[PDB]
Amino acid sequence: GSMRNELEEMQRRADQLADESLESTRRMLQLVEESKDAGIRTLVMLDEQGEQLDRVEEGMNHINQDMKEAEKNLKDLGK
């Protein structure tokens, strides 16, 4: 009947929505895969940076110790 055109539009809408939902899930996978890559890079960098910070702290400790000695020697030289 005349409603045939409307019924076909309804079918096209159902197919359109289903397809758009499918396409969205495919974009979701791309987004989370890129997010995961970013997270991995972040952890790799944080690990490297943590080792650097440990060496920096060790360095600060070394300087502290040496400066205590330098101060002792400078005071000894001054009097």
Binding site: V56, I63, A70, L77
Partner: protein, 63 residues
Amino acid sequence: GSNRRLQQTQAQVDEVVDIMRVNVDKVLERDQKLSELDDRADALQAGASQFETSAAKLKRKYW
């Protein structure tokens, strides 16, 4: 499952978003600390170099 899977996954995402929002703020704090330490460390090595030179002069004069 459709409906179930969706609500559950949305909840999972919301939780990670919450965690990451806090993480970003913590990293912005790390940024401020590191920027300051970057300047301090450069000034530290410069000061150490000056002291090293003075100490060398003391050695040359008194040893």
